[PDB]
Enzyme design. Structure first.
Site, PDB file in Angstrom:
ATOM      1  CD  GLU B  14      -2.826  -1.313   2.364  1.00 57.32           C
ATOM      2  OE1 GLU B  14      -2.223  -1.193   3.443  1.00 57.32           O
ATOM      3  OE2 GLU B  14      -4.048  -1.610   2.280  1.00 57.32           O
ATOM      4  CG  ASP B 199     -11.758  -7.616  -0.256  1.00 54.61           C
ATOM      5  OD1 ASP B 199     -12.721  -7.712   0.553  1.00 54.61           O
ATOM      6  OD2 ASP B 199     -10.689  -7.003   0.030  1.00 54.61           O
TER       7      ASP B 199
HETATM    8  N1  LIG Z   1     -12.528  -7.859   3.431  1.00 58.02           N
HETATM    9  C1  LIG Z   1     -11.775  -7.074   4.242  1.00 58.02           C
HETATM   10  N2  LIG Z   1     -11.933  -7.097   5.584  1.00 58.02           N
HETATM   11  C2  LIG Z   1     -11.239  -6.280   6.389  1.00 58.02           C
HETATM   12  N3  LIG Z   1     -10.285  -5.419   5.944  1.00 58.02           N
HETATM   13  C3  LIG Z   1     -10.045  -5.323   4.614  1.00 58.02           C
HETATM   14  N4  LIG Z   1      -9.225  -4.596   3.867  1.00 58.02           N
HETATM   15  C4  LIG Z   1      -9.329  -4.947   2.572  1.00 58.02           C
HETATM   16  N5  LIG Z   1     -10.311  -5.860   2.427  1.00 58.02           N
HETATM   17  C5  LIG Z   1     -10.775  -6.161   3.665  1.00 58.02           C
END
Ligand SMILES: Nc1ncnc2[nH]cnc12
Lengths: 231, 234
Positions: B14, B199
């Site tokens: 990141e 995601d």
């Molecule tokens: N699904 C997720 N749960 C918690 N933190 C995250 N950061 C990126 N994706 C995530």
């Protein structure tokens, strides 16, 4: 030698603050640090906030502003082991988060990336704390303390914690955060918690009644341990 | 520059793109964290790699504030998208942050609120406006709203269901933002989250995160670089 003291019990912090000689106060970030000497030993004292972020903030400020050699972290906790009694004092061997979960990537439950699964207290500090507690006619119990940002005191919730951490002796909301900060700065620490309530057993004392006695006992424990460590 | 812009990301992935663009770079390594100082396209910056989760973020934010005294904090990186219009790579901007895994409701607090804190931390209006101007200038898709944080990677099932139930207004979930907001609140430092979606916090979120972390890093980096420039002069 300079001893950092982080306490959760308001009355303990107040009593210790009152006892400190040549007191100065550092006020910042919604946090306050009291410095001076406790029975001749240089100390830095802070009342922990509630939950992991507040506790981490305080711990980091204390370390950066005061650079103590060790941390003693006191408070109260719920007992998970049925063999505990109200007023027992748990001394951490290790601390783990009960609410950390990156198991989707293969980590142990409670473990965060870049961290050990549990944060270990210093062997010398554990031994010193235990000896001091026992010298005060109290019962010291060494074991795992787990922490998280949910306040958990009911049967179902405590049973879930016990299923995830069967070796855990006690639960509260700040210990692991303070241990994590200390660990990451390579500062030796010990976590001590007076047991206010044991899972599934009704205490004979209200929480306020418990705190009135526990804070006095914990104050004496701190004074005793500070003296043992420094002198 | 008039302003020194603080930037916080959790992971190597990141921060790496921003870090490589810093001129006159110096590195502070303290407490398990790394802080990189210098100029980004002429603007003074202080970029923290905090590590993952709430305590790491809190520790790091505290160090960043004390050592560097940035005027504002932008939290960047990846996030799990909860709003229906978010695709991988899209931007999320906080209007507010809350802990999804804090519970002192037994004492009458709102779920997610901890004692001594507001139930949610409001992100700075000027920072939000600036972020939104950047989104428009860059022609990106974005959602502004509540971002929730916890020490759990959300992967469908009951973890996702619990968040949707308790915080149906949450547009994204991640593991640091609210912690940083909390430290900033304590010091009265303006804060905003500008992250990109890796995601959608579903059953496949771990696989999506693995595949698309780099895309989220690319888009969040583009946003942050653009925003830094917009904020440089107050
Ligand atoms: N699904 C997720 N749960 C918690 N933190 C995250 N950061 C990126 N994706 C995530």
């Amino acid at each position: 030698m300079k001893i950092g003291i982080i306490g959760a019990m308001e009355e303990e912090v107040t009593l210790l603050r009152d006892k400190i000689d040549n007191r100065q106060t550092i006020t910042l970030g919604g946090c306050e640090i009291y410095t001076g000497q406790l029975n001749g030993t240089e100390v830095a004292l802070l009342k922990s906030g509630i939950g992991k972020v507040a506790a981490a903030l305080g711990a980091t400020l204390l370390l950066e502003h005061c650079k103590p050699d060790v941390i003693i972290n006191t408070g109260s906790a719920g007992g998970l082991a049925s063999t505990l009694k109200v007023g027992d004092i748990v001394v951490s061997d290790e601390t783990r988060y009960h609410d950390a979960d990156v198991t989707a990537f293969g980590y142990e439950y409670g473990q965060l990336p870049g961290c050990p699964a549990g944060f270990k207290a210093d062997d010398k500090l554990i031994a010193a704390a235990e000896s001091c507690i026992r010298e005060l006619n109290l019962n010291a119990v060494r074991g795992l303390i787990v922490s998280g940002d949910a306040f958990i005191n009911g049967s179902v919730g405590l049973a879930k914690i016990r299923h995830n951490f069967p070796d855990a002796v006690a639960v509260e909301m700040e210990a692991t955060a303070i241990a994590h900060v200390c660990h990451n700065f390579n500062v030796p620490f010990v976590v001590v918690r007076a047991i206010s309530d044991v899972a599934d057993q009704q205490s004979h004392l209200s929480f306020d009644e418990f705190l009135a006695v526990a804070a006095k006992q914990s104050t004496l424990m701190v004074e005793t341990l500070v003296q043992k460590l420094a002198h």
